[PDB]
Design an enzyme around this catalytic site. Sequence first.
Site, PDB file in Angstrom:
ATOM      1  N   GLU B 200       0.838  -1.198   0.000  1.00 40.71           N
ATOM      2  CA  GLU B 200       0.000   0.000   0.000  1.00 40.71           C
ATOM      3  C   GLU B 200       0.886   1.267   0.000  1.00 40.71           C
ATOM      4  OE1 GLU B 200      -3.403  -0.436   2.729  1.00 40.71           O
ATOM      5  OE2 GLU B 200      -4.486  -1.508   1.138  1.00 40.71           O
ATOM      6  N   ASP B 209      -7.978  11.249  -5.064  1.00 39.98           N
ATOM      7  CA  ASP B 209      -8.769  10.499  -6.017  1.00 39.98           C
ATOM      8  C   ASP B 209      -9.783  11.513  -6.522  1.00 39.98           C
ATOM      9  OD1 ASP B 209      -9.832   7.011  -5.748  1.00 39.98           O
ATOM     10  OD2 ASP B 209      -7.995   7.910  -6.547  1.00 39.98           O
TER      11      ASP B 209
END
Lengths: 420, 415
Positions: B200, B209
């Site tokens: 990650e 995002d």
Amino acid sequence: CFRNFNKIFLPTIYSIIFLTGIVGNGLVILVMGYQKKLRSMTDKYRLHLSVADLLFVITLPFWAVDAVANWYFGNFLCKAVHVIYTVNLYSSVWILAFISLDRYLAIVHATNSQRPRKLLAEKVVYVGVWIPALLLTIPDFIFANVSEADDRYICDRFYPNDLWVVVFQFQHIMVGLILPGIVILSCYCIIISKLSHNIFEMLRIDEGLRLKIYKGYYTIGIGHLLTKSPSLNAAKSELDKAIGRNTNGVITKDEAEKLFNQDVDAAVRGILRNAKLKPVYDSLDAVRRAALINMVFQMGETGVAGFTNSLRMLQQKRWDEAAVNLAKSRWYNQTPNRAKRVITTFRTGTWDAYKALKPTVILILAFFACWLPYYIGISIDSFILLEIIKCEFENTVHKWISITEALAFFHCCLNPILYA
Amino acid sequence: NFNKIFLPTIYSIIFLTGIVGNGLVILVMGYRSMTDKYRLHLSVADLLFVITLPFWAVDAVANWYFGNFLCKAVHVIYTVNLYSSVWILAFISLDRYLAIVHATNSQRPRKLLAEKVVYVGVWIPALLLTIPDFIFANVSEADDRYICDRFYPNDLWVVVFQFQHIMVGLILPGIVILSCYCIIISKLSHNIFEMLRIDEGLRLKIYKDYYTIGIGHLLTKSPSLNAAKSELDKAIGRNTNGVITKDEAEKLFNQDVDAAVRGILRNAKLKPVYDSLDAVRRAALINMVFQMGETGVAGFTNSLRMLQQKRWDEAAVNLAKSRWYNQTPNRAKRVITTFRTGTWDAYKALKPTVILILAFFACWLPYYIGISIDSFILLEIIKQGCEFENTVHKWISITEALAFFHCCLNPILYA
Ligand SMILES: CC1(C)CN2C(CS/C(=N\C3CCCCC3)NC3CCCCC3)=CSC2=N1
Ligand SMILES: CC1(C)CN2C(CS/C(=N\C3CCCCC3)NC3CCCCC3)=CSC2=N1
């Protein structure tokens, strides 16, 4: 038996230590406490040691007044003097344990494992050494009281049975000497073992590790010269003679370590005999010692001893001068890169070509030396208490315990004494 | 009086279970995992002690008939067993620390520690601590019966040894065991950081995002940096200004792992699977929860079956058939390898050790409560009189024999 020849001589000892200890630790806290500049983690621990001593040395005129004539201080100050003595008794030795821990992390886990060295110096020391000792001081907060026995007042700890005495005088041996003493001796054995391996790793890069017999005479492992003889089977006989089994020209990485360690000890014992090399090796540190050993493994005892100016410059701590002088030699143009690494290792004192532990060793050993006669004394008192030795000898031993406890107090004015 | 019936009851069981039990263990590895070799040392230590248990029963029921020499010998065997058993468990904890925290750094000093250090540190110091018992244990020619025990000169000698017993026997080995466990629990909880760091990714700045910090820690779903900083400031208490430290990132990660384990342990489908899995394989399941979440991972009903059934090669091939594997191959391939092997290879047994140590201390726990109260009255803190003083002395007698089961928990451990 009954319970004073050294009682007008003994208060002078507390006074010497008070005068030296207050002035000594006072200027250390003056320098360290208000400064920002050159701070190896041990200096932070040394500040904790100096503050602990400073607080305790302030308590010494009380000891001296009690020894000369009486106890005019009262209830609260009798408790305070007893609690300040207990905190300094446990914190000091445990600061040395935390100093020894710091060294273990500095030598063994240098890069392998990121510092917890920051956490122990910045935060852990408070709740791991300071607070436990500050809470271990509670039995002395209430059991220590002022006695009005004769016109002469006696300030000390009055417990209830004796069976309460030995349980605390065992807690003192445990938390004061057993528990921190183990930590210090563990580090001192783990380091010297995993430090005399860095010598292996240094010489593997320089001399080279060959697990099979190579040449230009027959050689094995970290440059182990077997025989100058022009016969391979003769090299096998010399191999089997000093290793154990009939190996047959092939050895392994783990057992190669042993053979090399034997040659290191033989060279070290040889250096300690050479008139030129002996004082230089004794002067140098672990890493710089290994750099000089590396040279004996390449030139030889006589080969190293020849570098008159550079050896004198290494002995006199003149690093850059020694490195520049060594660069102007037969060896620097013989093996440019091996000499480059060794010269730069002598120059810095680090493994940067691939942290001083020496004053720490002096500090702990001097502290151990201070308290050693007292431990020799206290054991004899415990020996007579258990009925192992036999009244004149009993009270005369008590006399030495009084003086050795006061001579042991010299540990306070030593951390400042170390700055020479 | 009842202890004339109850002590031989406890001795008989512990003798039979202990002799048949420890006996098997010796003959199995009398002719190799290093956590077992110490377990063999325990059986030699425990069997010798069980061999002396008929003497305890005879002398609890009726008389000492075995003379002065055998009185000293039973006292020494008990002493050797008391100190070796606990110190073998310390060496068991020490070996696991070197096998988990220094898996490469200090590769095989364990090969020496289990072959050389064990005799110089567990056996010899315990057999040299047998000396006071060799001197002070003797047969008292009393009126109606002969008594076998230690008779010291003064009550001080009693205190010296009865406190030395608590140090080399309880404080010193316990301090080693607890510290080893505290460092192992820190390294394997570290180890999961490195796993997720590779998967990650670790950073101290932000992304979008979806504002994120550390190792995939979502700050806020809202598109406002003021809120991203506000969530960060409150996450670690102190003022952040949008930046954190690598060591400070671990604190946030541990919070994220512990909350995920709190999720799994409050989920009917994932709780039996997590409890059954080992430290390495537990971290792989956690890794999946950080990607899918509880509901997503709990969906792999056929996969979770084989994970809690110790059938790794069956689970790995079944998981490579999922939507999750083909859509995200690199991470899923690495996580499947973690379940399949139980090693960190894509980026050493611990449970029997922990059970053995907890069971040993649980065995000895009631005796320590009883010996604690007895020392409180002897030192004068508690005061009900002599009625509860004998009730406490009755407790010590029963709890000490009831704490001999520690001899049994090594062969019984094979379940
Ligand atoms: C361990 C201890 C704190 C205990 N103690 C002792 C026994 S108390 C004590 N005075 C002091 C000891 C330290 C705290 C202040 C009182 N006694 C007498 C009192 C009259 C003069 C001679 C010494 C002597 S030196 C020492 N060190
Ligand atoms: C710590 C210790 C070894 C000390 N002790 C004791 C005291 S000795 C002893 N018999 C044995 C204990 C261990 C070695 C053999 C003698 N007493 C009596 C004799 C009268 C009936 C009850 C038991 C009992 S159980 C126990 N545990």
